[PDB]
């Protein structure tokens with residue numbers, strides 16, 4: 677809509693206050709004109725029609741419980757935009773400042789959130805398995821990173837390529853969570869999963885086995901469920917990424933940690949320059965090694981640590 681750029685205030689899913697960029701034309705709309713071609717957040721009104729209505733509010737105050745999913749979808753899309761622009765010089769998910777559109781209150785009791793090829797879609801959860809999923813910055817950035825992948829390497833969504841696709845989204849979801857630097861960790865979805873249970877999450881990057889996911893290539897899932905285990909086998913790559921950043925000793929292999937920023941630079945370069953739709957784990961290792969070589973030199977600690985981490989998880 678055409679209007680004046682304004683700044684509203686509200687509370688997110690977890691009760692935290694934050695400012696949001698809005699547009700004023702009779703109503704205050706969740707339309708942030710400060711980032712690229714805009715960030716737009718929509719009310720799906722418990723339907724499955726998309727995108728729904730551009731979110732309208734009478735007073736630029738967003739403290740109602742019904743507002744909270746919209747506040748967080750809008751704000752965390754902004755954080756994700758800021759991460760990709762400030763850290764990687766990438767303008768929105770397509771690198772060409774595409775508008776970021778999000779719909780909240782999608783369907784009823786819907787325990788999922790997804791990038792659908794042109795926008796983000798957030799269920800409210802059923803209140804037991806999940807609360808509204810836009811409350812999780814890592815979920816928001818995980819799904820928007822699928823769009824990044826789609827516009828770069830094009831990793832399919834099955835078998836090893838799909839597990840890399842998933843891990844890439846977990847890695848950058850987590851790096852966005854650290855960039856926001858409110859309550860970061862190496863867990864996925866902890867803020868919105870199981871409100872009755874403290875200390876759990878959908879999966880752990882630092883210890884995938886905590887939830888039964890593999891932390892070594894020899895433990896990879898080879899069945900047909902979950903598109904060949906894409907959310908399961910991602911633990912193998914997630915653990916390698918965790919080791920690259922934080923270091924550690926894993927199955928007897930010592931990894932010297934190089935920190936989060938270099939982890940992100942290495943994997944971003946691998947994703948955008950070297951991966952292809954059918955890259956497998958071994959090819960991801962090669963891409964990460966070459967990316968670290970490009971950035972830091974073949975004799976660098978960074979290259980050596982990439983190799984150590986993939987050795988530790990059994991990927992040659």
Ligand SMILES: O[C@@H]1[C@@H](O)[C@H](O)OC[C@H]1O
Nearest residue numbers: 677678679680681699709
């Ligand atoms: O409403 C305006 C918006 O449509 C435009 O894109 O950028 C400036 C805004 O104030």
Ligand SMILES: O[C@@H]1[C@@H](O)[C@H](O)OC[C@H]1O
Nearest residue numbers: 763851852854855936937
């Ligand atoms: O924590 C990371 C920060 O250290 C780096 O500067 O850029 C990415 C962030 O996630």
Ligand SMILES: O[C@@H]1[C@@H](O)[C@H](O)OC[C@H]1O
Nearest residue numbers: 860861862863882883922
């Ligand atoms: O977040 C990590 C945590 O999972 C681990 O237990 O201790 C080190 C941290 O980096």
Ligand SMILES: O[C@@H]1[C@@H](O)[C@H](O)OC[C@H]1O
Nearest residue numbers: 884885886887888889890
């Ligand atoms: O020890 C873990 C176990 O507690 C869980 O039930 O399944 C996965 C294992 O890694």
Ligand SMILES: O[C@@H]1[C@@H](O)[C@H](O)OC[C@H]1O
Nearest residue numbers: 892893894895927928990
């Ligand atoms: O062969 C693998 C071994 O090298 C490693 O130590 O742990 C898992 C095994 O499958």
Ligand SMILES: O[C@@H]1[C@@H](O)[C@H](O)OC[C@H]1O
Nearest residue numbers: 835836897898899904905
């Ligand atoms: O069966 C597949 C297995 O061969 C591969 O290694 O990892 C993904 C699985 O789907």
Ligand SMILES: O[C@@H]1[C@@H](O)[C@H](O)OC[C@H]1O
Nearest residue numbers: 950951959960962963966
């Ligand atoms: O196969 C790819 C290779 O061509 C390139 O050199 O680095 C990435 C690899 O995965």
Ligand SMILES: [Ca+2]
Nearest residue numbers: 814863864865
């Ligand atoms: Ca997290």
Ligand SMILES: [Ca+2]
Nearest residue numbers: 869870871873
């Ligand atoms: Ca929980």
Ligand SMILES: [Cl-]
Nearest residue numbers: 882883924926
């Ligand atoms: Cl560990």
Ligand SMILES: [Cl-]
Nearest residue numbers: 882883891926
């Ligand atoms: Cl471990």
Ligand SMILES: [Cl-]
Nearest residue numbers: 923924925926
């Ligand atoms: Cl460790």
Ligand SMILES: [Cl-]
Nearest residue numbers: 925926927928
């Ligand atoms: Cl271990």
Ligand SMILES: [Zn+2]
Nearest residue numbers: 733735737738
């Ligand atoms: Zn209001």
Ligand SMILES: [Zn+2]
Nearest residue numbers: 789790791819
């Ligand atoms: Zn998803």
Ligand SMILES: [Zn+2]
Nearest residue numbers: 818822842845
């Ligand atoms: Zn995903």
